[PDB]
Symmetry: D2
Subunit: 341 residues, 4 copies
Amino acid sequence: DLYENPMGLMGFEFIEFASPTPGTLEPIFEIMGFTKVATHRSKNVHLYRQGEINLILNNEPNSIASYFAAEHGPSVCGMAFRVKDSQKAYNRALELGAQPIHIDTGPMELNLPAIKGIGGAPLYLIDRFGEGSSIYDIDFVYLEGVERNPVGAGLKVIDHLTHNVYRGRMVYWANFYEKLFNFREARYFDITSKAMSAPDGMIRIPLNEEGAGQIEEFLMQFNGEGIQHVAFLTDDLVKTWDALKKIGMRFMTAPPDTYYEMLEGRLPDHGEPVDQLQARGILLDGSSVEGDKRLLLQIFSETLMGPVFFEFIQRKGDDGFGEGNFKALFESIERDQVRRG
Amino acid sequence: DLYENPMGLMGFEFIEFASPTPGTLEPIFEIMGFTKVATHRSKNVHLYRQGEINLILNNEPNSIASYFAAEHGPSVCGMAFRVKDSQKAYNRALELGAQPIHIDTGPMELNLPAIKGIGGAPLYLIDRFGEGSSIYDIDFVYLEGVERNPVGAGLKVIDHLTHNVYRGRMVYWANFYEKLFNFREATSKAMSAPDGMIRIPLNEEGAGQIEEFLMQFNGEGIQHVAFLTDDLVKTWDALKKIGMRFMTAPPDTYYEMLEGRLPDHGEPVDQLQARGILLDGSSVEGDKRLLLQIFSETLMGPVFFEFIQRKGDDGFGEGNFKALFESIERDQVRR
Amino acid sequence: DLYENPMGLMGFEFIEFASPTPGTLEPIFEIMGFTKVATHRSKNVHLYRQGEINLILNNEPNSIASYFAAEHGPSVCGMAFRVKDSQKAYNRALELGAQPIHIDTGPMELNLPAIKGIGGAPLYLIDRFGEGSSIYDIDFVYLEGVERNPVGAGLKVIDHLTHNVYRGRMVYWANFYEKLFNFREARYFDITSKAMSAPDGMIRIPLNEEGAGQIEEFLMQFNGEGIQHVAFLTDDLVKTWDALKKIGMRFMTAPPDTYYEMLEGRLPDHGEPVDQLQARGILLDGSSVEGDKRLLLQIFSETLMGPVFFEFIQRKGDDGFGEGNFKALFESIERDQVRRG
Amino acid sequence: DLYENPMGLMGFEFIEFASPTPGTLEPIFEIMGFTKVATHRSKNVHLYRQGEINLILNNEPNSIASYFAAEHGPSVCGMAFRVKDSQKAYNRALELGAQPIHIDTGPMELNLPAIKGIGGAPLYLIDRFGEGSSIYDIDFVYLEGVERNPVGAGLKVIDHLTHNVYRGRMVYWANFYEKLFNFREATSKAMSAPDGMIRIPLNEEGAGQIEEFLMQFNGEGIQHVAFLTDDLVKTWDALKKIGMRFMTAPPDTYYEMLEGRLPDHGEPVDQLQARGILLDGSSVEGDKRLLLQIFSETLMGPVFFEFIQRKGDDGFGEGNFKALFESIERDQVRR
Ligand SMILES: Cc1ccccc1-n1c(=O)c2c(C)c(C(=O)C3=C(O)CCCC3=O)ccc2n(C)c1=O
Ligand SMILES: Cc1ccccc1-n1c(=O)c2c(C)c(C(=O)C3=C(O)CCCC3=O)ccc2n(C)c1=O
Ligand SMILES: Cc1ccccc1-n1c(=O)c2c(C)c(C(=O)C3=C(O)CCCC3=O)ccc2n(C)c1=O
Ligand SMILES: Cc1ccccc1-n1c(=O)c2c(C)c(C(=O)C3=C(O)CCCC3=O)ccc2n(C)c1=O
Ligand SMILES: [Co+2]
Ligand SMILES: [Co+2]
Ligand SMILES: [Co+2]
Ligand SMILES: [Co+2]
């Protein structure tokens, strides 16, 4: 409860996926250790689960997600927050100037309220959850025999979703979340990024601005502003790595060996087993001041759904996002190209 | 079981009430042995229960039930059938020509399908039922601590409810329940459903007690709801104990004629006659298909309730009409 | 401007017709001297006209009129009032408890507001009218060459539409028009009828209650409350009669010859040419007190659309509805059966 | 005439403006020579006219135009094509995959069809036009007495309007106007319509003046609207007389290069250079396809307007880009 929470937020509830071409999102869920676990009572949409992360696969045609997918490709096409009271939130959001998104509801099914968010993605406000009570219990039908609490590679919750937005728009969306939900900028990065945290301490949505770089090509390939990477939290990254590598997950190529030598200059006495991080390509960041250890282990997938990739992170006291790895990696590729030509 | 169930009916699920005067519907559920059990998550609507009977009290203003109540006063303003697949039924009713009634659904609540039925009241088609999965477990907040399976005076299910329609419209409403739900007829018309549990009898007709209902009710509508019980003498002493008002007893001449009209019925005539309970049925080939029944006052405008116990008779107490008539002649003559 | 007119009423605008079977309403319009004069830009609905009476033929399938026609047969299925400001009226009606009826509007076409009236018939509130401005100019397309102000047999305006309602409901609908439009009961008849006039002096809607009579059979055959007869006004009834008889109009059988002899006892010095009324079956009513002549000539068609019939009336100072003709006709059939057996 | 017109386009019908600050849009229509002529029958929306150009000022709150204006400031927030059959076009656009924008229509008003076009602004499809039968004769109340055909500074039609889109989205919007309306391309892309009158050029591109527009505008949108006139020197003295602010003149070196770049153009170079007017075209085979043009300041955020006169050139003044660039070098060197 970090500051005033007028919308009654209580963390991420679920993320929605859709693609214009079929069979492109199912196999990606598999390699990240997610399991299909239920199917909608009426619609052609499906629930994948791992730890406490719910992921919805929307394959409904002429639906709001398939239009979003028709324009952006394979994508994160929806995003739901947990709220205490979702009509108090939905009303307050429309009073403060949000535009509704009508999600068509079938008979005997739950009217899910959304507003227009990033890229035109619906932002749902959900006030039912918990076993037996959840919207998965009400509106979904679980697979016979299958388990409803799969643990997979050990991913626990969504840590954050970071958006890429067009030059200028970072301040626009930053006011969107500040005005309607009372988000606050907790961090700033100048390499350009604003780290918007929710008053619940769980919902983190970083926003990124570029020219001629990694962000500008994302907006070209995504055909608009959208979620660049989804970050899953894990209790142990190296074990999640093995369990993820066991099931065909592909990661970005490890940094040069130089990167792992410089670790004891960068973060003296971090305590991490460098052999184990070097054997997997895992990165590390944080700061080490006066006996207080704040660190962060993270590794990225390659791009998997169009220009969207994923992050697997374990936090050891650092509430940042790996920002130091950008300078750390350039000095690494630098010393390693120097050492060879 | 009887025959084919193209809409998958599985009994009555709930009936709904509305009134344009407050504090008039609650006292009537109470002396009928119903207990407030749950309150809607957001609207001013309430769940009263006894046995497996579900009574929704709708006090939501500017709504479907209030506009209905403003025209017809205290009424049964909605009726819900239970169904296997509510979506296939909804579209089937519509493609066969039914009209939809849209019921305004709040955020995070259940979108309830209904067509327009008798007198304009919504006919809901509900496919969520049973403990933990019904529409009350979802959209209603049970009074915390309160026993949520109250049994009360021992009323079990909604046996039937009947409709008073204007002259000529018996056929119109029989068709409506024939075309859409495959009801079969088994002046009155006893329309029974393919699931063996949903019975809707349709009455017409002048200057009599149906003419009086359609005046006092301001249109077609449900005239009485009948709740079944297993021991009507037992249900009677319970229902009396809490304040029920019955229509007053026949003249004792009605009881002199019992073993003449229903030879060897076997009922404790004294225990019945002490409570004004009616009898009806037939005794043929030693098979004594019989039934007990009593009614109440008009309690919601011209609407009242019947409390029946079925000892093998599939009827509704019809012969009680001629049977009472002769009890008033043989009492007038001896008066 | 007879009393306070909060809804800003200015007479009848149009009457709407629909039948479950085709070719049953077109030939009836003909014999009453109405002319097809336009067709809707998009919908399969048509304008018939004569003097200032507009009549709409709605043949649109799955429309609100075809559902009303599916239940009541050939019928008057809609009714529109002229108003000064139709959103002030439509708002006020919904504040005072009327239920809206949504009439589906096509693109580039006019949203017509209605509320639920008698039988579930929509009551439209129209604030555009007058040549060039009317809804017929906006939403309708006139037939090439054809005239747009046909005069026919000389029928001028709708004088009144009288409804039949179930026993008891006369007071209900009387409060409907009193509450929402400030109608007042101007006459009462005990034979049972309430004569509801509008605060503009033009809109007249009598309501009729029955048992075992002319009204009870109407509700049986109409399958509900509805308009029993539509009354057209004419400047000269006997000339309208000839012009109507010229085009195949069929009337109710004339009263006995007895009826026309008793006329000078009933209404001394009425001045009407009795030969001309007797030659046509036209009826007469009014009262004759102290040099003031208030009279009323009228004749009825047979039933033409199911149980619905029509009235052609000419008013000479009597603001009634022919009520005296009910007693006048029984005493007529009485003397005439006496004079023969 | 050019080629087949599957949506039956027949020119621009109106453009719509909205701003989230009051009293900022009206002064700009006035110095541009537009006159308030009509006011909506019920909403706070207004019709400004000059020539055959129709400008709708939408000040309706809690509406489609205000939400658009709150995001992008003073803007062109809607654009209407004129069409033979608006219903067949509407359904055709939808069956080809366009999305609908619903515009909330009051009682007794016209239900205006629109799809979602550039930047999210409605693209209306209007089939009522001309005097006595247009949407202004119906839904708008003309100021009584006011001359309803004002001619002003002699601007006639909307020549074109252009869109600034983000990098890569030129193709996206070309397809959108190719698939739905059969526009043909005839960094920029000049999309022209099958009716020979509707031209929408699409621009992208960094750190330049398009990057600056999509920042200052907060998305894709119309960057300038161009109104055609028959005598641009005449339109200039009129437009100046009433307060127009132009982008200031080229350096005189731009005029030393005219008869070098456009041999024997024949234009009164002194009358142009006194007004900062630009020239462009080609002279080949004695056919001198040429055009005159001037722009204004940014007047609605980063949006401005162009006033062109076409002497046989079908272009947009493109060569003026290189032509000015060389006028700033040859002026910097001599400075
Ligand atoms: C994955 C990748 C591919 C090709 C070029 C570069 C990368 N790449 C990243 O994208 C990357 C990101 C995206 C983060 C990161 O999560 C992040 C936040 O969530 C919010 C604030 C801004 C930010 O940097 C951290 C380290 C990263 N590092 C070290 C890396 O190399
Ligand atoms: C007539 C009357 C007046 C004042 C209160 C009560 C009564 N009244 C009834 O309403 C009454 C009813 C309503 C039934 C009955 O339930 C029944 C059905 O359920 C459907 C078929 C037709 C029918 O009548 C049976 C006997 C009745 N009897 C015997 C009686 O006296
Ligand atoms: C036409 C008809 C057929 C078979 C039985 C009778 C008739 N019949 C009528 O229906 C009839 C009517 C309907 C009126 C009449 O217009 C009317 C009003 O508009 C409102 C108040 C009640 C009323 O009577 C007047 C005279 C009538 N007369 C004289 C007649 O014979
Ligand atoms: C660059 C600039 C800065 C500050 C104000 C004005 C300008 N500016 C323009 O905006 C400008 C435009 C906008 C056009 C033009 O209308 C045109 C089209 O209509 C579509 C094809 C691409 C294109 O450019 C032509 C010449 C122009 N010129 C010469 C100029 O200077
Ligand atoms: Co991250
Ligand atoms: Co009964
Ligand atoms: Co009449
Ligand atoms: Co231009």
